[PDB]
Write an enzyme that holds these catalytic residues in place. Structure first.
Site, PDB file in Angstrom:
ATOM      1  N   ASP A  24      -8.010  -0.056  -8.611  1.00 44.22           N
ATOM      2  CA  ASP A  24      -7.438  -0.496  -7.350  1.00 44.22           C
ATOM      3  C   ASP A  24      -6.931  -1.941  -7.413  1.00 44.22           C
ATOM      4  O   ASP A  24      -5.836  -2.264  -6.908  1.00 44.22           O
ATOM      5  CB  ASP A  24      -8.482  -0.357  -6.244  1.00 44.22           C
ATOM      6  CG  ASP A  24      -7.860  -0.128  -4.880  1.00 44.22           C
ATOM      7  OD1 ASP A  24      -6.616  -0.124  -4.782  1.00 44.22           O
ATOM      8  OD2 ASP A  24      -8.611   0.057  -3.898  1.00 44.22           O
ATOM      9  N   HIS A  49       0.793  -1.232   0.000  1.00 45.90           N
ATOM     10  CA  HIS A  49       0.000   0.000   0.000  1.00 45.90           C
ATOM     11  C   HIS A  49       0.839   1.302   0.000  1.00 45.90           C
ATOM     12  O   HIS A  49       0.712   2.183   0.881  1.00 45.90           O
ATOM     13  CB  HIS A  49      -1.024  -0.063   1.111  1.00 45.90           C
ATOM     14  CG  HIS A  49      -2.133  -1.014   0.812  1.00 45.90           C
ATOM     15  ND1 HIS A  49      -2.300  -2.202   1.489  1.00 45.90           N
ATOM     16  CD2 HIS A  49      -3.102  -0.981  -0.136  1.00 45.90           C
ATOM     17  CE1 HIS A  49      -3.343  -2.842   0.993  1.00 45.90           C
ATOM     18  NE2 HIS A  49      -3.847  -2.124   0.004  1.00 45.90           N
ATOM     19  N   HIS A  67      -5.520   7.893  -2.837  1.00 51.15           N
ATOM     20  CA  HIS A  67      -6.561   7.035  -2.272  1.00 51.15           C
ATOM     21  C   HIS A  67      -6.125   6.177  -1.086  1.00 51.15           C
ATOM     22  O   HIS A  67      -6.969   5.596  -0.400  1.00 51.15           O
ATOM     23  CB  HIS A  67      -7.183   6.174  -3.363  1.00 51.15           C
ATOM     24  CG  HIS A  67      -6.400   4.941  -3.680  1.00 51.15           C
ATOM     25  ND1 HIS A  67      -5.322   4.937  -4.543  1.00 51.15           N
ATOM     26  CD2 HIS A  67      -6.540   3.664  -3.251  1.00 51.15           C
ATOM     27  CE1 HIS A  67      -4.828   3.712  -4.627  1.00 51.15           C
ATOM     28  NE2 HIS A  67      -5.548   2.920  -3.851  1.00 51.15           N
ATOM     29  N   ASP A  68      -4.809   6.083  -0.879  1.00 48.01           N
ATOM     30  CA  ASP A  68      -4.208   5.265   0.192  1.00 48.01           C
ATOM     31  C   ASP A  68      -3.124   6.032   0.935  1.00 48.01           C
ATOM     32  O   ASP A  68      -2.353   5.449   1.698  1.00 48.01           O
ATOM     33  CB  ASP A  68      -3.597   3.958  -0.345  1.00 48.01           C
ATOM     34  CG  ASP A  68      -4.630   2.881  -0.627  1.00 48.01           C
ATOM     35  OD1 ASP A  68      -5.682   2.816   0.056  1.00 48.01           O
ATOM     36  OD2 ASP A  68      -4.366   2.083  -1.554  1.00 48.01           O
TER      37      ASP A  68
HETATM   38  C1  LIG Z   1      -9.276  -5.296  -0.436  1.00 42.54           C
HETATM   39  N1  LIG Z   1      -8.445  -6.244  -1.153  1.00 42.54           N
HETATM   40  C2  LIG Z   1      -7.766  -6.036  -2.331  1.00 42.54           C
HETATM   41  C3  LIG Z   1      -7.112  -7.223  -2.587  1.00 42.54           C
HETATM   42  C4  LIG Z   1      -6.241  -7.531  -3.664  1.00 42.54           C
HETATM   43  C5  LIG Z   1      -5.955  -8.893  -3.972  1.00 42.54           C
HETATM   44  C6  LIG Z   1      -5.113  -9.343  -4.905  1.00 42.54           C
HETATM   45  C7  LIG Z   1      -4.430  -8.313  -5.699  1.00 42.54           C
HETATM   46  O1  LIG Z   1      -3.654  -8.674  -6.565  1.00 42.54           O
HETATM   47  N2  LIG Z   1      -4.741  -7.002  -5.397  1.00 42.54           N
HETATM   48  C8  LIG Z   1      -4.087  -5.973  -6.154  1.00 42.54           C
HETATM   49  C9  LIG Z   1      -5.607  -6.622  -4.398  1.00 42.54           C
HETATM   50  C10 LIG Z   1      -7.461  -8.061  -1.496  1.00 42.54           C
HETATM   51  C11 LIG Z   1      -7.059  -9.430  -1.231  1.00 42.54           C
HETATM   52  O2  LIG Z   1      -6.666 -10.088  -2.431  1.00 42.54           O
HETATM   53  C12 LIG Z   1      -6.419 -11.306  -1.884  1.00 42.54           C
HETATM   54  C13 LIG Z   1      -7.522 -12.105  -1.761  1.00 42.54           C
HETATM   55  C14 LIG Z   1      -7.372 -13.334  -1.180  1.00 42.54           C
HETATM   56  C15 LIG Z   1      -6.135 -13.751  -0.756  1.00 42.54           C
HETATM   57  C16 LIG Z   1      -6.127 -15.001  -0.075  1.00 42.54           C
HETATM   58  C17 LIG Z   1      -7.335 -15.456   0.407  1.00 42.54           C
HETATM   59  C18 LIG Z   1      -7.369 -16.614   1.132  1.00 42.54           C
HETATM   60  C19 LIG Z   1      -6.176 -17.250   1.320  1.00 42.54           C
HETATM   61  C20 LIG Z   1      -6.194 -18.409   2.037  1.00 42.54           C
HETATM   62  C21 LIG Z   1      -5.017 -19.083   2.246  1.00 42.54           C
HETATM   63  C22 LIG Z   1      -3.839 -18.591   1.737  1.00 42.54           C
HETATM   64  C23 LIG Z   1      -3.848 -17.420   1.021  1.00 42.54           C
HETATM   65  C24 LIG Z   1      -5.012 -16.730   0.794  1.00 42.54           C
HETATM   66  N3  LIG Z   1      -4.956 -15.597   0.101  1.00 42.54           N
HETATM   67  C25 LIG Z   1      -5.030 -12.935  -0.906  1.00 42.54           C
HETATM   68  C26 LIG Z   1      -5.159 -11.687  -1.475  1.00 42.54           C
HETATM   69  N4  LIG Z   1      -8.276  -7.466  -0.617  1.00 42.54           N
HETATM   70 MG   LIG Z   2      -7.331   0.796  -0.257  1.00 44.93          MG
HETATM   71 ZN   LIG Z   3      -5.587   0.731  -2.947  1.00 47.39          ZN
END
Ligand SMILES: Cn1cc(-c2ccc(=O)n(C)c2)c(COc2ccc(-c3ccc4ccccc4n3)cc2)n1
Ligand SMILES: [Mg+2]
Ligand SMILES: [Zn+2]
EC number: 3.1.4.17
Length: 324
Positions: free
Chosen positions: A228, A79, A117-118
Protein backbone atom coordinates in the site's frame (compact mmCIF):
# COMPACT_ATOMS: atom_id res chain seq x y z
CA UNK A 1 -25.86 0.24 -8.63
CA UNK A 2 -22.67 -1.46 -9.80
CA UNK A 3 -20.68 -0.67 -12.91
CA UNK A 4 -19.59 -3.08 -15.62
CA UNK A 5 -17.23 -3.51 -18.56
CA UNK A 6 -18.24 -3.86 -22.19
CA UNK A 7 -17.47 -6.69 -24.62
CA UNK A 8 -14.95 -4.44 -26.41
CA UNK A 9 -12.93 -3.81 -23.25
CA UNK A 10 -12.59 -7.29 -21.85
CA UNK A 11 -11.91 -8.81 -25.28
CA UNK A 12 -9.35 -6.05 -25.87
CA UNK A 13 -7.68 -7.14 -22.65
CA UNK A 14 -8.01 -10.88 -23.52
CA UNK A 15 -5.87 -9.98 -26.54
CA UNK A 16 -2.89 -8.46 -24.66
CA UNK A 17 0.70 -9.63 -25.09
CA UNK A 18 3.25 -8.00 -22.78
CA UNK A 19 6.39 -6.73 -24.57
CA UNK A 20 9.44 -8.92 -23.96
CA UNK A 21 11.63 -6.09 -22.61
CA UNK A 22 9.17 -5.65 -19.70
CA UNK A 23 9.38 -9.26 -18.39
CA UNK A 24 12.72 -8.19 -16.93
CA UNK A 25 11.75 -4.96 -15.13
CA UNK A 26 8.42 -6.08 -13.72
CA UNK A 27 10.29 -8.59 -11.54
CA UNK A 28 12.20 -5.77 -9.76
CA UNK A 29 10.51 -4.41 -6.63
CA UNK A 30 11.27 -0.79 -7.62
CA UNK A 31 9.39 -1.16 -10.91
CA UNK A 32 7.04 1.63 -11.86
CA UNK A 33 3.92 1.13 -13.89
CA UNK A 34 3.28 4.85 -14.60
CA UNK A 35 4.57 5.16 -18.20
CA UNK A 36 2.75 2.08 -19.49
CA UNK A 37 -0.93 2.76 -18.71
CA UNK A 38 -2.31 1.16 -21.86
CA UNK A 39 -0.89 -2.06 -20.48
CA UNK A 40 -1.99 -1.64 -16.88
CA UNK A 41 -4.86 -4.09 -16.97
CA UNK A 42 -2.83 -6.43 -19.18
CA UNK A 43 0.01 -6.32 -16.68
CA UNK A 44 -2.13 -7.65 -13.79
CA UNK A 45 -3.16 -10.53 -16.02
CA UNK A 46 0.48 -11.35 -16.75
CA UNK A 47 1.21 -11.45 -13.04
CA UNK A 48 -1.71 -13.65 -12.16
CA UNK A 49 -0.54 -16.17 -14.80
CA UNK A 50 3.06 -16.03 -13.63
CA UNK A 51 1.95 -16.60 -10.02
CA UNK A 52 -1.01 -18.92 -10.43
CA UNK A 53 -0.71 -20.43 -13.92
CA UNK A 54 -2.98 -19.80 -16.92
CA UNK A 55 -5.24 -22.60 -15.52
CA UNK A 56 -6.11 -20.93 -12.20
CA UNK A 57 -8.77 -18.71 -13.81
CA UNK A 58 -11.23 -18.77 -16.71
CA UNK A 59 -9.70 -16.11 -18.95
CA UNK A 60 -13.01 -14.71 -20.17
CA UNK A 61 -14.27 -14.41 -16.58
CA UNK A 62 -10.95 -12.91 -15.44
CA UNK A 63 -10.60 -10.17 -18.02
CA UNK A 64 -14.29 -9.45 -17.41
CA UNK A 65 -13.52 -9.01 -13.67
CA UNK A 66 -10.30 -6.93 -14.08
CA UNK A 67 -12.05 -4.39 -16.27
CA UNK A 68 -15.27 -4.08 -14.20
CA UNK A 69 -13.03 -3.32 -11.23
CA UNK A 70 -11.24 -0.76 -13.42
CA UNK A 71 -14.66 0.89 -13.78
CA UNK A 72 -15.46 1.05 -10.07
CA UNK A 73 -12.21 2.99 -9.62
CA UNK A 74 -13.00 6.71 -9.60
CA UNK A 75 -10.94 9.24 -11.57
CA UNK A 76 -9.39 10.68 -8.40
CA UNK A 77 -5.81 12.04 -8.04
CA UNK A 78 -4.31 9.18 -6.06
CA UNK A 79 -6.70 6.53 -4.69
CA UNK A 80 -7.28 5.43 -8.28
CA UNK A 81 -6.67 2.52 -10.67
CA UNK A 82 -3.01 3.53 -11.09
CA UNK A 83 -2.70 2.91 -7.36
CA UNK A 84 -4.45 -0.46 -7.23
CA UNK A 85 -2.20 -1.77 -9.90
CA UNK A 86 0.91 -0.33 -8.26
CA UNK A 87 0.04 -2.01 -4.98
CA UNK A 88 -0.88 -5.29 -6.71
CA UNK A 89 2.50 -5.17 -8.53
CA UNK A 90 4.10 -5.10 -5.11
CA UNK A 91 2.15 -7.96 -3.55
CA UNK A 92 3.12 -9.99 -6.62
CA UNK A 93 6.73 -8.88 -6.36
CA UNK A 94 6.62 -10.14 -2.79
CA UNK A 95 4.83 -13.44 -3.44
CA UNK A 96 7.16 -14.43 -6.28
CA UNK A 97 10.13 -13.77 -3.97
CA UNK A 98 8.72 -16.07 -1.23
CA UNK A 99 7.37 -18.75 -3.47
CA UNK A 100 7.15 -21.73 -1.10
CA UNK A 101 5.59 -19.77 1.72
CA UNK A 102 1.99 -19.24 0.62
CA UNK A 103 -0.82 -21.56 -0.46
CA UNK A 104 -2.36 -21.48 -3.94
CA UNK A 105 -5.51 -20.32 -2.17
CA UNK A 106 -3.39 -17.42 -0.82
CA UNK A 107 -1.58 -15.81 -3.81
CA UNK A 108 -4.99 -15.61 -5.51
CA UNK A 109 -7.02 -13.94 -2.72
CA UNK A 110 -4.27 -11.39 -2.16
CA UNK A 111 -3.36 -10.35 -5.72
CA UNK A 112 -7.11 -9.92 -6.04
CA UNK A 113 -7.48 -8.06 -2.71
CA UNK A 114 -4.64 -5.73 -3.71
CA UNK A 115 -6.53 -4.75 -6.86
CA UNK A 116 -9.78 -4.31 -4.98
CA UNK A 117 -8.52 -2.74 -1.77
CA UNK A 118 -9.65 0.84 -2.58
CA UNK A 119 -12.48 0.14 -4.99
CA UNK A 120 -14.64 3.26 -5.17
CA UNK A 121 -12.41 5.58 -3.22
CA UNK A 122 -14.04 9.01 -3.31
CA UNK A 123 -10.74 10.71 -2.44
CA UNK A 124 -11.64 11.51 1.15
CA UNK A 125 -10.36 9.97 4.36
CA UNK A 126 -12.13 7.77 6.91
CA UNK A 127 -11.72 10.64 9.36
CA UNK A 128 -13.44 12.91 6.81
CA UNK A 129 -16.55 10.74 6.44
CA UNK A 130 -16.78 9.71 10.10
CA UNK A 131 -16.22 13.11 11.69
CA UNK A 132 -19.00 14.54 9.37
CA UNK A 133 -20.99 12.69 8.15
CA UNK A 134 -21.54 10.47 5.13
CA UNK A 135 -24.12 7.68 4.53
CA UNK A 136 -20.94 5.58 4.67
CA UNK A 137 -20.00 6.50 8.28
CA UNK A 138 -23.69 6.16 9.06
CA UNK A 139 -23.60 2.41 8.26
CA UNK A 140 -19.97 1.33 8.57
CA UNK A 141 -18.86 2.86 11.85
CA UNK A 142 -15.22 1.72 11.83
CA UNK A 143 -12.75 1.18 8.97
CA UNK A 144 -15.47 2.72 6.82
CA UNK A 145 -13.78 2.77 3.42
CA UNK A 146 -12.05 -0.56 4.02
CA UNK A 147 -15.33 -2.53 4.41
CA UNK A 148 -16.98 -0.65 1.60
CA UNK A 149 -13.85 -1.45 -0.42
CA UNK A 150 -14.74 -5.06 0.27
CA UNK A 151 -18.52 -4.94 -0.08
CA UNK A 152 -17.58 -3.37 -3.44
CA UNK A 153 -15.36 -6.41 -4.08
CA UNK A 154 -18.21 -8.63 -2.86
CA UNK A 155 -20.76 -7.19 -5.27
CA UNK A 156 -18.44 -7.21 -8.27
CA UNK A 157 -17.99 -11.02 -8.11
CA UNK A 158 -21.76 -11.39 -7.72
CA UNK A 159 -22.13 -9.95 -11.27
CA UNK A 160 -22.92 -11.99 -14.39
CA UNK A 161 -20.08 -14.28 -15.51
CA UNK A 162 -17.71 -12.28 -13.30
CA UNK A 163 -17.49 -14.80 -10.45
CA UNK A 164 -13.94 -15.89 -10.97
CA UNK A 165 -13.98 -18.18 -7.92
CA UNK A 166 -16.85 -20.38 -9.17
CA UNK A 167 -14.43 -23.29 -9.51
CA UNK A 168 -14.01 -23.86 -5.74
CA UNK A 169 -15.85 -25.58 -2.88
CA UNK A 170 -18.18 -23.42 -0.80
CA UNK A 171 -15.52 -24.12 1.83
CA UNK A 172 -12.59 -22.77 -0.26
CA UNK A 173 -14.66 -20.03 -1.87
CA UNK A 174 -15.67 -18.96 1.66
CA UNK A 175 -12.04 -19.36 2.78
CA UNK A 176 -10.70 -16.98 0.16
CA UNK A 177 -13.41 -14.36 0.65
CA UNK A 178 -12.25 -14.50 4.29
CA UNK A 179 -8.58 -14.28 3.17
CA UNK A 180 -9.53 -11.17 1.20
CA UNK A 181 -11.76 -9.62 3.89
CA UNK A 182 -8.92 -9.66 6.39
CA UNK A 183 -6.26 -8.63 3.82
CA UNK A 184 -8.30 -5.62 2.66
CA UNK A 185 -9.12 -4.61 6.29
CA UNK A 186 -5.35 -4.64 6.89
CA UNK A 187 -5.06 -1.52 4.69
CA UNK A 188 -6.63 0.73 7.34
CA UNK A 189 -3.21 2.27 8.16
CA UNK A 190 -4.52 3.02 11.65
CA UNK A 191 -4.60 -0.72 12.23
CA UNK A 192 -1.01 -1.27 11.09
CA UNK A 193 0.38 0.13 14.34
CA UNK A 194 -1.13 -2.46 16.73
CA UNK A 195 -0.42 -5.06 14.03
CA UNK A 196 3.27 -4.24 13.63
CA UNK A 197 3.52 -4.04 17.41
CA UNK A 198 2.78 -7.74 17.79
CA UNK A 199 4.95 -8.70 14.84
CA UNK A 200 7.94 -7.02 16.47
CA UNK A 201 7.30 -8.97 19.68
CA UNK A 202 6.64 -12.38 18.13
CA UNK A 203 9.92 -11.88 16.32
CA UNK A 204 11.73 -10.68 19.46
CA UNK A 205 10.59 -13.63 21.55
CA UNK A 206 10.39 -15.77 18.42
CA UNK A 207 7.01 -17.41 19.11
CA UNK A 208 5.67 -16.69 15.64
CA UNK A 209 3.78 -19.72 14.39
CA UNK A 210 3.50 -19.79 10.60
CA UNK A 211 1.13 -22.70 11.30
CA UNK A 212 -1.03 -20.61 13.65
CA UNK A 213 -3.80 -19.23 11.42
CA UNK A 214 -4.22 -15.99 13.47
CA UNK A 215 -0.49 -15.31 13.65
CA UNK A 216 -0.51 -16.04 9.91
CA UNK A 217 -3.15 -13.43 9.04
CA UNK A 218 -1.02 -10.68 10.64
CA UNK A 219 1.93 -11.20 8.30
CA UNK A 220 -0.49 -10.61 5.41
CA UNK A 221 -1.70 -7.41 7.14
CA UNK A 222 1.79 -5.96 7.22
CA UNK A 223 2.23 -7.29 3.67
CA UNK A 224 -0.76 -5.29 2.53
CA UNK A 225 0.48 -2.21 4.33
CA UNK A 226 3.92 -2.73 2.87
CA UNK A 227 2.47 -2.84 -0.69
CA UNK A 228 0.00 0.00 0.00
CA UNK A 229 2.79 2.40 0.95
CA UNK A 230 5.09 1.09 -1.71
CA UNK A 231 5.17 4.36 -3.62
CA UNK A 232 7.89 5.27 -1.15
CA UNK A 233 10.14 2.45 -2.42
CA UNK A 234 10.18 3.51 -6.05
CA UNK A 235 13.19 5.41 -7.41
CA UNK A 236 13.40 9.03 -6.30
CA UNK A 237 11.67 10.66 -9.29
CA UNK A 238 8.74 8.18 -9.32
CA UNK A 239 8.23 8.76 -5.60
CA UNK A 240 8.73 12.48 -6.07
CA UNK A 241 5.76 12.82 -8.41
CA UNK A 242 3.43 10.36 -6.62
CA UNK A 243 3.80 12.60 -3.60
CA UNK A 244 1.91 15.32 -5.52
CA UNK A 245 -0.84 12.82 -6.18
CA UNK A 246 -1.41 12.26 -2.51
CA UNK A 247 -1.01 16.01 -1.98
CA UNK A 248 -3.63 16.95 -4.61
CA UNK A 249 -6.18 14.71 -2.86
CA UNK A 250 -5.11 15.77 0.60
CA UNK A 251 -5.42 19.47 0.02
CA UNK A 252 -8.53 18.95 -2.08
CA UNK A 253 -10.08 17.47 1.10
CA UNK A 254 -8.67 20.28 3.25
CA UNK A 255 -10.14 22.79 0.83
CA UNK A 256 -13.50 21.16 1.46
CA UNK A 257 -13.15 21.72 5.17
CA UNK A 258 -12.01 25.33 4.58
CA UNK A 259 -15.24 26.01 2.61
CA UNK A 260 -17.11 25.59 5.94
CA UNK A 261 -14.60 27.79 7.75
CA UNK A 262 -12.86 24.74 9.23
CA UNK A 263 -9.06 24.66 9.65
CA UNK A 264 -7.93 21.32 8.24
CA UNK A 265 -4.82 19.72 9.82
CA UNK A 266 -1.63 21.18 8.20
CA UNK A 267 -1.29 17.95 6.16
CA UNK A 268 -4.46 18.71 4.13
CA UNK A 269 -3.72 22.39 4.17
CA UNK A 270 -2.32 23.48 0.80
CA UNK A 271 -1.26 26.85 2.23
CA UNK A 272 1.47 24.94 4.05
CA UNK A 273 3.18 23.60 0.86
CA UNK A 274 6.60 24.14 2.35
CA UNK A 275 6.29 21.96 5.50
CA UNK A 276 5.93 18.87 3.30
CA UNK A 277 9.40 17.33 3.19
CA UNK A 278 9.48 17.87 6.91
CA UNK A 279 6.16 16.05 7.16
CA UNK A 280 7.06 13.34 4.66
CA UNK A 281 10.27 12.70 6.61
CA UNK A 282 8.37 12.20 9.81
CA UNK A 283 6.13 9.72 8.04
CA UNK A 284 9.08 7.83 6.61
CA UNK A 285 10.60 7.73 10.07
CA UNK A 286 7.49 7.04 12.19
CA UNK A 287 5.60 4.88 9.71
CA UNK A 288 7.36 3.65 6.52
CA UNK A 289 10.74 2.49 7.90
CA UNK A 290 9.39 0.72 10.99
CA UNK A 291 7.06 -1.02 8.53
CA UNK A 292 9.52 -2.25 5.91
CA UNK A 293 11.92 -3.13 8.67
CA UNK A 294 9.64 -5.59 10.53
CA UNK A 295 8.94 -6.98 7.04
CA UNK A 296 12.49 -7.48 5.84
CA UNK A 297 12.73 -9.05 9.27
CA UNK A 298 10.08 -11.79 8.81
CA UNK A 299 10.70 -12.12 5.04
CA UNK A 300 14.41 -11.44 4.39
CA UNK A 301 13.72 -11.42 0.52
CA UNK A 302 11.82 -8.16 1.06
CA UNK A 303 15.10 -6.36 1.78
CA UNK A 304 15.18 -4.31 -1.50
CA UNK A 305 12.05 -2.43 -0.31
CA UNK A 306 13.69 -1.19 2.92
CA UNK A 307 16.87 -0.51 0.90
CA UNK A 308 15.02 1.74 -1.51
CA UNK A 309 12.75 3.08 1.23
CA UNK A 310 15.86 4.59 2.82
CA UNK A 311 17.24 6.02 -0.43
CA UNK A 312 14.16 8.25 -0.69
CA UNK A 313 14.21 9.26 2.93
CA UNK A 314 17.79 10.32 2.38
CA UNK A 315 16.54 12.51 -0.48
CA UNK A 316 13.81 14.19 1.55
CA UNK A 317 16.58 15.02 4.09
CA UNK A 318 18.49 16.69 1.28
CA UNK A 319 15.40 18.65 0.21
CA UNK A 320 14.99 19.88 3.81
CA UNK A 321 18.68 20.58 4.29
CA UNK A 322 18.44 22.54 1.01
CA UNK A 323 19.77 20.30 -1.77
CA UNK A 324 17.07 19.46 -4.37
C1 LIG B 1 -2.78 6.24 5.25
N1 LIG B 1 -1.70 6.96 4.60
C2 LIG B 1 -0.90 6.51 3.58
C3 LIG B 1 -0.04 7.56 3.31
C4 LIG B 1 0.97 7.63 2.31
C5 LIG B 1 1.98 8.62 2.41
C6 LIG B 1 2.96 8.86 1.53
C7 LIG B 1 2.97 7.99 0.35
O1 LIG B 1 3.85 8.17 -0.49
N2 LIG B 1 1.99 7.03 0.28
C8 LIG B 1 1.98 6.16 -0.86
C9 LIG B 1 1.01 6.86 1.23
C10 LIG B 1 -0.43 8.58 4.21
C11 LIG B 1 0.12 9.91 4.38
O2 LIG B 1 1.45 9.98 3.89
C12 LIG B 1 1.69 11.27 4.23
C13 LIG B 1 2.11 11.45 5.52
C14 LIG B 1 2.34 12.73 5.96
C15 LIG B 1 2.16 13.79 5.11
C16 LIG B 1 2.32 15.07 5.71
C17 LIG B 1 2.26 15.12 7.08
C18 LIG B 1 2.33 16.34 7.71
C19 LIG B 1 2.48 17.43 6.90
C20 LIG B 1 2.56 18.65 7.51
C21 LIG B 1 2.71 19.77 6.73
C22 LIG B 1 2.78 19.66 5.36
C23 LIG B 1 2.69 18.42 4.78
C24 LIG B 1 2.54 17.28 5.53
N3 LIG B 1 2.45 16.11 4.90
C25 LIG B 1 1.75 13.58 3.80
C26 LIG B 1 1.51 12.31 3.34
N4 LIG B 1 -1.45 8.21 5.01
MG1 LIG C 1 -6.54 2.61 1.56
ZN1 LIG D 1 -4.40 2.08 -0.78
Amino acid sequence: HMSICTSEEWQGLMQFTLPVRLCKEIELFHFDIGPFENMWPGIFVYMVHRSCGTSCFELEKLCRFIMSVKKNYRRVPYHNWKHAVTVAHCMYAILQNNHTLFTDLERKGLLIACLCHDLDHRGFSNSYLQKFDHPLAALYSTSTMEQHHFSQTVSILQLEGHNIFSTLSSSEYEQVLEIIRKAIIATDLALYFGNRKQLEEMYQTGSLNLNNQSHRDRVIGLMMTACDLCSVTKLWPVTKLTANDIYAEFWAEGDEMKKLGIQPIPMMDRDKKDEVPQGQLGFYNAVAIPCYTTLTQILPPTEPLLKACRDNLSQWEKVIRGEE
